[PDB]
Amino acid sequence: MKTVIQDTADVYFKRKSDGKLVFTAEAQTASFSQAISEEKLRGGIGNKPLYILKSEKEINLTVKNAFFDLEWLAMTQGETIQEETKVKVFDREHGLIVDDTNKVTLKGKPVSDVTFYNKKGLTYKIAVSTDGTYTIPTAFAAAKDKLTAVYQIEKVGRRLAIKASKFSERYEVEYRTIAYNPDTEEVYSDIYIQFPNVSPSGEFEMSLENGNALAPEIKFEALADTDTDEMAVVIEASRDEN
Amino acid sequence: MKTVIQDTADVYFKRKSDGKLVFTAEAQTASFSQAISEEKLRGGIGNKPLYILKSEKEINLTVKNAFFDLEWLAMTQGETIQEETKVKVFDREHGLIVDDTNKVTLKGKPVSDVTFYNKKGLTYKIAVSTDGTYTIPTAFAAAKDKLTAVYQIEKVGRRLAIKASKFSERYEVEYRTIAYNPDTEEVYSDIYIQFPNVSPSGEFEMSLENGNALAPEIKFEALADTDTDEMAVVIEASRDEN
Amino acid sequence: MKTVIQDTADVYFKRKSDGKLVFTAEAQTASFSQAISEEKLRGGIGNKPLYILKSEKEINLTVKNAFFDLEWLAMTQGETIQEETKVKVFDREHGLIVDDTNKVTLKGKPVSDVTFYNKKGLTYKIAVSTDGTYTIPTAFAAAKDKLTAVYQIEKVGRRLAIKASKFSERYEVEYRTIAYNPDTEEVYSDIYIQFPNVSPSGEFEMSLENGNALAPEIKFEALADTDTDEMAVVIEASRDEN
Amino acid sequence: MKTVIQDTADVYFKRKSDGKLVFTAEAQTASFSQAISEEKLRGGIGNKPLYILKSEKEINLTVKNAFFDLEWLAMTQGETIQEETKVKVFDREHGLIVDDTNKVTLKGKPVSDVTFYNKKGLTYKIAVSTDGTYTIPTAFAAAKDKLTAVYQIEKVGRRLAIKASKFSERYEVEYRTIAYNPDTEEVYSDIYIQFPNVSPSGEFEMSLENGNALAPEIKFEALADTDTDEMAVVIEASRDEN
Amino acid sequence: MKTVIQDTADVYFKRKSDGKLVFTAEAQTASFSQAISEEKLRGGIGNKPLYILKSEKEINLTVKNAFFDLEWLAMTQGETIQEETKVKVFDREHGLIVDDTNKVTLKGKPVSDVTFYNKKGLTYKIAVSTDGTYTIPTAFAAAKDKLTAVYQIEKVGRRLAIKASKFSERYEVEYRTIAYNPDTEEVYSDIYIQFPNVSPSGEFEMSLENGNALAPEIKFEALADTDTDEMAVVIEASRDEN
Amino acid sequence: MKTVIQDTADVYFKRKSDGKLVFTAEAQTASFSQAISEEKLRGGIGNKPLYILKSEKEINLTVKNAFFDLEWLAMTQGETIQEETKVKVFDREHGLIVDDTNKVTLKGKPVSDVTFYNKKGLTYKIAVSTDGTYTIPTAFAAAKDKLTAVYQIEKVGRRLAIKASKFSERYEVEYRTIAYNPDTEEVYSDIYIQFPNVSPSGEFEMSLENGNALAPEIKFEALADTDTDEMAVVIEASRDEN
Amino acid sequence: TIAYNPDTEEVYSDIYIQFPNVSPSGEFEMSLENGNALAPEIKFEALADTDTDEMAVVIEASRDEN
Amino acid sequence: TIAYNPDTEEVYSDIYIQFPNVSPSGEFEMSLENGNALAPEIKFEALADTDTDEMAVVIEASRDEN
């Protein structure tokens, strides 16, 4: 039946090896496209077409979300997220006042050499202090000087590694959307588009800009199923025949 | 007569071997274009053009609709829609509360393993249970813990399959529109454009965006009729001579 | 004299073989352009230009109209328009009610097997009956079910055929515009641009969009005259010298 | 001195063969540009540039006017305007009423066959009657039937012919513009950019569109002078020293 | 130190051969850019990047001013401005009334043939009259016929010549701008960017359009110093340490 | 966990050889991107995709700041800032009034020849006066007429040099951003994208335009780590598990 | 084949080239490549006719003389 | 021909190459094609001078020493 589609899709990804299931229900774009190669075989007196050679049917997918998820990076890289891993990150503490006896005391737990910045913009790299007390030179600051310290600390959290020779697995994807009724103006059916053998594409981009909410985007390439030789299945199951 | 056209076309497609007929009366664009290859033959002292070699008269068609219809994808793929087919789709259930004995009861009909999601985005893939009771570990959730279950269910509906080796048949297309009278401002005639041997083009794209009504689009390539060697026929039958 | 041009041109095409004359006076654009090939000879100590080789003067024309005219398509195709030809077109009938005895009666005169559409987009192809009464199965509709019928009818009108091996003949084009007098703001003269040997170009496009008035457009290529070796003649005739 | 230029240039062209002089003072754009070819000679260890090779100094000009002149087309084509020449142009008469005896009387002086157009856009090509009375068939029109006649007439005016193998000769061009004084806001000098030896360029385009005032444009290519080997002489002559 | 730059730069050019110094303090854009060529050397199993080859470090400069200087054109051409040179330019005067005895008296100092223009755009090229009285033919004008005369006069001014085989020598360039303080909102420092060996680029363009103030633009290519192998030097000098 | 990112990233760079640490906390853009090379291996009857070859995983970075830092230019060039260096720059003095005895006295400390500019843009280069008194010729200026002097002075400050055969060395970059909770609208975690082994790209551009604040931009290319073969490490440590 | 008329762009005549005694040449090649449409090719060697001693006859027959 | 100066970018010298006893070679070709400007070409064979036994002399004359 001729129906109206005015919404986006809810997307489900599944991994073929172990069945790891991811889903997104706050998408902003879900699209797929098909392209083939055509050529004309000609001859005779007139240069008139005699045959058409068609081959290389190819299908691509693109999904663009509204929130951020590390699992999307996982699918793109074909890696795994290690939970509760210890990591070493940078930290900044600014506003330390040099005392009368040119001693500065840190309020954090450094792991590497501390670097101090004076108001003019010069650097001084000292090693870690046991009591966290540093004898700053008089040529750097004298008294009532606000200085800044940049040191590495230790943190625990999730971790994902992007290796130089690790690629992606094969997945099974499905979009779901709804189709309305032009006459009655009420939901008529549910439309499911299923791809049974896809490969995540290795090209992605992440761009952080001030005042802009990040919308990550992922791409896939659809391949023919190993036995049924399908590439995609479109289903328009209705809401009264279930 | 010099007339004014200010509307789009109603489109009719007919399959050759079978005779299956599809019509669209809510179109948004119907266009056709012609291209031709030209070359000049030069010579003599002045190096002046002497002859023009012309060949390769090619015609293309494009139709863009306002509603969605699966038969358009059927024409593009050269396949058939199988009514009332059983299919496996995904479903989501929100708000399951883990009870005192750490047990969650499902109100659906899963077919595969049920995957559970806690509020911190962690997964637990339990196999299907008979009664529909699942013992969620204490390390996963506690009393009054909303969870999520993603399971596969069964539905029935129309199914269309896209394969890697099946292509399109040959069709017969016709546009119909109306032409007005500049002097009297009333409908003067009906204009019919008939293509008797076309081939659907395998290139298409379907993009679902939030808040945007989908307008599907299809393309064809026109070929010369095998008997009459016609590529298209334009008719401007009047509304007084019928 | 230095004059002002602020208008389009009335165009007068005319075939050479027979003298068939077509004229348009509601044009929207009339343009012509000239191109030429240049090259430089170099040599000596310094690599200085020593000669400019000029050749291949070419002229093209473009006309864009405000009304639709089948004779323009005839001119592009170099083909004639047959008058009062019998043609077989499509027609649609909506709202046929299935009676108590599942009989549907058509009000038209089908010339091929009718196709019926129910409210759920299902088709039923039945050969044309004598009285125009058809027995719709109860599995299709029972009673008070609006149905749609698509059948072919016969009409009388003009007909133009586009063939795969038919090309255009030669014409003689001429524009005409008026030039104003900057000092006195009155029509000073008439400007005629005459091309005596042109060839219509087969590239054309017809796009029908809802809410948009069609503006057809045609192109020509100008060639040198056989004897006088002219390509175009510009004439400015004053309105006092006649 | 540092001055402000905020105007266009009055342009003067002069033919070298005979001294024929054309000027335009209602110009709209006057520009000239210089291009040159450079390359680097490298070598040794490190692949560092050891030399720069420069050659091919070229200069181009462009002038765009506000009025229309046949003289500019004459410069581009290197032809001559043969004033007061007899020409054969088209004309059209609307409203000829066919009288009772089916006769139409023309009020013009045809030279070729008259073509009649009826209300439905059908043609009738009659030869030239002496008295100017034509017998229109009953199958074409009846009493009180406004018809239209298209015929060729004779006029006199200036004729410019564009040829397939005729090119342009050399010229001498000069711009003129004024410069202001940023301190006193008064004219300080006059800039006279002079090109001793240029060549008109064959590229040309005329486009007539409804409601648009035509602005013709011409392009030149500057060449080195025969003896002094100059290509342009920028002069800034003050108006308090002449 | 982290500062804010929100202005252009005063620009200074100095010639190497003789030390001629030019400066611009009303600039509108001063920019420089660096480009380099990079390649990857790969090999082994896995095709991994094993080395990076980088070379051809190149630097370019661009300056755009707000006033007009002939010295900029001299700099680009590598030539010299010759002060107080006699030149022959065009002049024109409107409204010469032809008297009763068809004599027109010029009020200028012609050097070449005087060309007369009537109100109908026709020319008459008369030689130079000793007294300055010209006998205009009665077939050209009559009593009270305002005419136009175009003739060449003599003036004195600065002359710059552009030749086909002369290029630019080497220069030394410097930009100067100021850098503010984010905290105190006061000027903090002066930024000097010095290029010690540049070559002016021969590409330039000068376009004069009505109502548009001309902004000339010049480009340079920076080259390594012959002994220090420096391409540019950036100096950030404070206003308290001088 | 599905989170919202709406901010930029604080960026930290560290030099590998000596540990010199730079940071920016007023950034405007921090992005990284991944690219990969894919190819399809086909064969057999049907020309079907039989294998996919993937290699050349490449990662790039781009940072765009809001303030100016000479250290960024040093990082791109792989050079060092030699603070407190003596430099020779240009200076300008306006309003020098020529006295009765055509003597002009400077108020600065010239190092090289002083160049004088009169009101008509004429130059006069004189050597350095011991006392600072110059005898301006009466042919240049007479009295109560203001002149301009351009001379070189000496200053002290930082100095970064750019050479033709010095490139950048390897660094270690890290971003930091915060993520929000869609339900509670509170900060949930911190994201630390870490690149262990990058290479600065020697392609920058500085453009100073009037009334436009400058935002410098730097680029990097990430390389695989020598032992772990990682290219980047996305970390999403939380703010309640820490 | 057909020959066109440069002045009027209409088929002027038909051109027939007849060889009355040829011998097929045994050299031939058949190459099957994926994605490539095969175009077979054959060669002949022309010999003089036994009696008339002709080797080939070129005929141009106009479309108005039949 | 002329020879430049890598340092000063100005013309430095004139290079003269002198052959005192040559024989023009009889091989030549002249081809006229539409749209192609003809560039004729000639060849010689250099022979030893009858008394000095020189086949060629290369002279590099400066523009300041003449």
Numbering used by the authors:
A (entry chain V), B (entry chain U), C (entry chain T), D (entry chain Y), E (entry chain X), F (entry chain W): 1 to 242
G (entry chain H), H (entry chain L): 177 to 242
Can you quote the paper on this entry?
We next determined the cryo-EM structure of TTP at a resolution of 3.1 Å. The majority of TTP could be unambiguously built, with the exception of the C-terminal portion (aa 240–264), possibly due to intrinsic flexibility. TTP proteins polymerize into a tube with a diameter of ~50 Å. In each layer of the TTP tube, six TTP molecules are stacked in a head-to-tail arrangement, forming a hexameric ring structure. Each TTP subunit adopts an extended conformation with two β-sandwich domains (termed BS1 and BS2, respectively). The BS1 domains oligomerize into the hexameric ring, which is decorated by the BS2 domains at the periphery. Notably, one helix (aa 68–78) is docked into a groove created by these two β-strands and the “head” of the BS1 core, forming a network of hydrophobic intramolecular interactions, suggesting the importance of this helix (α1) in TTP assembly. The BS2 domain packs against the BS1 domain of the adjacent molecule, further stabilizing the hexameric ring. A β-hairpin (aa 36–56) extending from the BS1 domain interlocks the hexameric rings to form the tube. Together, three major intermolecular interfaces, including the two β-strands, BS2 and a β-hairpin-mediated interfaces, facilitate the TTP assembly.
The defense-associated sirtuin 2 (DSR2) effector, a SIR2 domain-containing protein, protects bacteria from phage infection by depleting NAD+, while an anti-DSR2 protein (DSR anti-defense 1, DSAD1) is employed by some phages to evade this host defense. The NADase activity of DSR2 is unleashed by recognizing the phage tail tube protein (TTP). DSR2 is arranged as a dimer of dimers, which is facilitated by the tetramerization of SIR2 domains. DSR2 has a two-domain architecture, with the CTD responsible for sensing the infection signal and SIR2 acting to prevent phage propagation.
